[PDB]
Design a protein around this ligand. Sequence first.
Ligand code: FAD
Length: 456
Amino acid sequence: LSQDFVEALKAVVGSPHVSTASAVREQHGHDESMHRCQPPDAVVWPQNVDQVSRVASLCYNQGVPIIPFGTGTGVEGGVCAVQGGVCINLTHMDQITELNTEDFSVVVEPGVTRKALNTHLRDSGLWFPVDPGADASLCGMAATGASGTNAVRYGTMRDNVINLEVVLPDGRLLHTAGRGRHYRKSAAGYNLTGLFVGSEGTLGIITSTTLRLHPAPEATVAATCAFPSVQAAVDSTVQILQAAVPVARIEFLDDVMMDACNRHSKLNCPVAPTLFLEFHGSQQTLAEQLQRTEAITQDNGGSHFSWAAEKRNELWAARHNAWYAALALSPGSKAYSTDVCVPISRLPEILVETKEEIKASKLTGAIVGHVGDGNFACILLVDPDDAEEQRRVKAFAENLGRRALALGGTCTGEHGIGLGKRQLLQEEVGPVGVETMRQLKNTLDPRGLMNPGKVL
Ligand SMILES: Cc1cc2nc3c(=O)[nH]c(=O)nc-3n(C[C@H](O)[C@H](O)[C@H](O)COP(=O)(O)OP(=O)(O)OC[C@H]3O[C@@H](n4cnc5c(N)ncnc54)[C@H](O)[C@@H]3O)c2cc1C
């Protein structure tokens, strides 16, 4: 970047909020995945929405790419500055506003994480359920279309984002559902909110998200259940869903993942393919759900439930840290993850096949998943200097993605496309789907400067 351009950035946000230092740029050139660090030319921290708009306008009109940056916990290289440009770290805008506990809604700026929001909501009787394992920006979660362990019951970001405030690439300010609006449903015009959820910073910069809040459960019971095989655990999952048990959380760990989590969190669960389960309701409904769910797990050889506030917190903290538990198996490694989501009846085939394919390869892989959604991840751990292994991991990852597509599924349930799944997306939606998404990208970002090289 030219000195005049850097000075123009400083005129918007203040000198302390622009950095061209190599170390600062490198820290903002990668996320939590193995995608190689590609440092932006500068990092900028806008202090309010007017500054976001003015930074975007400056970059856009000068032909400088823009990379929105939340907490950098993505796993598909979304923040990697493949074409250089200006990384906009949005986290200094960290206010919670418009808390409407009678309407079950709240507005959050990009610096607000789920942990911050739920802390703010203590003693309100309400909580925000969508729970990625990382302490991520809620606006970043809206940008990636995130889900979590609670999504099976409480919905994904797509289900729980009611409105978005978006700085469009040329600086215009859009409130997708209208400024200040919040409501349960609408047929008014075209739904713009859903277009920006899962847009990954390629259509605009989310500067606030209006979120649906949920009532805290009357009572909570968590447990683990060990199974003799992956087949038995996944058949149990499908049967629980087909029986319509309204489970709050149903998470799968294969034996490799279970052992990794044991070693990383001081859990002592039997090393086996395992379901972590949670149930919400009254004492009467809990007993009913438990009895129907234990009957199904027993049919498939599940252990008697190992019951788990502080043990439950310990259980879910270990699950939330599964990514790092995997990484700890091979110190110094980075990881790539698959994220397929298939029709639930096909989940047994593809999980068992994935386990068999991992075993037949020399690759280390841990399997963990939001199986209540028909979704799972294979975390594939790689030596950053071993080029040949990564090609095998990439090849394994595409082949699994294509297998999910053959089953009528999707290549990503929650993580997004970023740099890693662009070819899979083309196969998933075909030429008319690709052209339609690209036309939408072009009307919002004519110059192609809004996080270039990602998604499409
Ligand atoms: C341990 C661990 C566990 C995880 N568990 C889950 C899980 O259960 N479910 C899940 O879905 N993901 C999970 N993730 C992935 C990641 O946390 C989510 O994708 C999260 O939504 C990323 O948010 P972020 O702000 O950290 O993203 P970043 O890495 O900062 O950015 C991600 C992408 O979104 C864009 N972006 C970020 N903020 C904005 C914004 N305000 N406006 C526009 N674009 C923006 C970026 O340009 C980039 O393309 C996990 C990650 C880790 C490390």
